[PDB]
Paper text:
Here, we uncover the ADP-ribose (ADPr) hydrolase NUDT5 as an unexpected, noncovalent, off-target of clinical BTK inhibitors. Surprisingly, we identified ibrutinib, an irreversible covalent BTK inhibitor, as a hit. Ibrutinib is an FDA-approved Bruton’s tyrosine kinase (BTK) antagonist used for the treatment of various cancers including B-cell leukemias and lymphomas. Among the compounds tested, 1 stood out as the most potent inhibitor (IC50 = 0.837 ± 0.329 μM), yet the other two acrylamide-based molecules 4 and 5 also exhibited weak activity (IC50 > 10 μM). To understand the binding mode of 1, we solved a cocrystal structure with NUDT5 at a 2 Å resolution. This suggested that no covalent bond was formed between the acrylamide warhead and the protein despite the presence of a potentially accessible proximal cysteine (C139) due to the acrylamide moiety pointing out of the protein toward the solvent. Similar to previously determined NUDT5 inhibitor-bound structures, the main heterocyclic ring of 1 is stabilized by π–π stacking interactions between W46 of chain A and W28 of chain B in the active site. In addition, the aminopyrimidine moiety is stabilized by hydrogen bonds with E47 and the phenoxy group protrudes deep into the hydrophobic pocket where interactions are mediated with the side chain of R51.
Their name derives from a common substrate structure, nucleoside diphosphate linked to another moiety X.1 The characteristic NUDIX box is shared between family members and contains a sequence motif “GX5EX5 [UA] XREX2EEXGU”, where U is usually valine, leucine, or isoleucine and X is any amino acid. In particular, the nature of their physiological substrates remains an object for debate, e.g., NUDT5 not only predominantly hydrolyzes ADP-ribose (ADPr) to AMP and ribose-5′-phosphate but also exhibits activity against 8-oxo-dGDP, 8-oxo-GDP, 8-oxo-dADP, 2-oxo-dADP, and 5-CHO-dUDP. A recent systematic exploration of the NUDIX family confirmed that both NUDT5 and NUDT14 are able to hydrolyze ADPr and ADP-glucose, yet the function and cellular roles of NUDT14 remain elusive. Here, by screening a small kinase inhibitor library, we identify ibrutinib as a dual inhibitor of NUDT5 and NUDT14 catalytic activities.
Author numbering:
A (entry chain C): 14 to 54, 58 to 208
B (entry chain A): 14 to 52, 58 to 207
Write the structure that this text describes.
């Protein structure tokens, strides 16, 4: 009993547009929302949850540090990015993971499309859990191949103390942790 | 190394604005980005663990219509922090408004980013326990904000990822990425 009635363009940039969304609320009253959408009419992207498994060591979660212009600061994130021209989620996952980290991994699982920020945008991603065989030579000396203007520092953090490692990074190096990463670190503790 | 050079307004809405951000890259080249912003940390998301004697713990989630998405999304209770409000007060207030439960603080994250490729939106993630043995959390009544309409869905922590998968298979609705990320780690632990 709620639905979109109309979308009116407010402002279109190269990558991102702002829209006045009109919609019916449940009382039968009409209401507006300001909404963001891409200029490029599938989920939009993938985030990879990369579990670096090496025997006789803790499993690690591989994260990336990048400068994020909207945040005007460095942010710690799961490797992620846009699914490219008719490409599958899984394959965008391995690719992004290689481009961003150098690791070559195997799919363990793939989420349905999930919303990034539904109070603001219609951005959806697939979250893909990937195990990295860290005892295979391909992953011995992993080589990041980042595309034009992509500057990405890898940080692998033990999965055993993930939440504590994340909080320490915020307290020390004043960077921001992504909410999906934080959510995952929390649940590792909460499963107790 | 890298830093913001300038922010030039493209368009101002009542609530959100689009800006052209110019930043210094690490090679020392000037670059641009399109960034969304509002007109502390903006908000809270509540992780509500319903605890009851002789029950498995539940995670309390809300279903709401999300205009940006064109349909209904399953979320952690979440809302903006009012001026002068603490994250924890907001968390508890939003939880009660959205679900009817009165919770107790367990923990509060640092500010974390929602969508850093797009906005500077940050939240605190606030873990709250709900004493479901207490008489006030027996028949909880939502008291939603102005133009706010919520259904409550409580799922066992010990089965969250599977129960979310079911809901997505049976209904026409999206799970939020933070919810789905939490359900995954539960299974991975
Ligand atoms: C060469 C490579 C490259 O630079 N790329 C790769 C190709 C273009 C990328 N891009 N595109 C974005 C962007 C797009 C989508 C975003 O979320 C969504 C929003 C609404 C609905 C769905 C998703 C967020 C951000 C972003 C920007 N706001 N400004 C500047 N450019 C950046 C960057
Ligand atoms: C129930 C409550 C209520 O009705 N309110 C009263 C209070 C105002 C609320 N509001 N505001 C928003 C909004 C603001 C910012 C958003 O993201 C960002 C947050 C921080 C930094 C960057 C981005 C997303 C959404 C939203 C809208 N985009 N359209 C229309 N109004 C809605 C509406
Ligand atoms: Mg990326
Ligand atoms: Mg990438
Ligand atoms: Mg809310
Ligand atoms: Mg609310």
């Amino acid at each position: 009993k709620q639905y979109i009635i109309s979308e009116e363009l407010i402002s279109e940039g190269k990558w991102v547009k702002l829209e006045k969304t009109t919609y019916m609320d449940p009382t039968g009253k009409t209401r507006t929302w300001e909404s963001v959408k891409r200029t490029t009419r599938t989920a939009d992207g993938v985030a990879v949850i990369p579990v670096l498994q090496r025997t006789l060591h803790y499993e690690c979660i591989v994260l990336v540090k990048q400068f994020r212009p909207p945040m005007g600061g460095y942010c710690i994130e799961f490797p992620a990015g846009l699914i490219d021209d008719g490409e599958t989620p899984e394959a965008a996952a391995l690719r992004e993971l290689e481009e961003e980290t150098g690791y070559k991994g195997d799919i363990a699982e793939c989420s349905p499309a999930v919303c990034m920020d539904p109070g603001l945008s219609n951005c959806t991603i697939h979250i893909v859990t990937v195990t990295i065989n860290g005892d295979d030579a391909e992953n011995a000396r992993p080589k990041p191949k980042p595309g034009d203007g992509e500057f990405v520092e890898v940080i692998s953090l033990p999965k055993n103390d993930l939440l504590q490692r994340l909080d320490a990074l915020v307290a020390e190096e004043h960077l921001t942790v992504d909410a999906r990463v934080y959510s995952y670190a929390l649940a590792l503790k909460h499963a107790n």
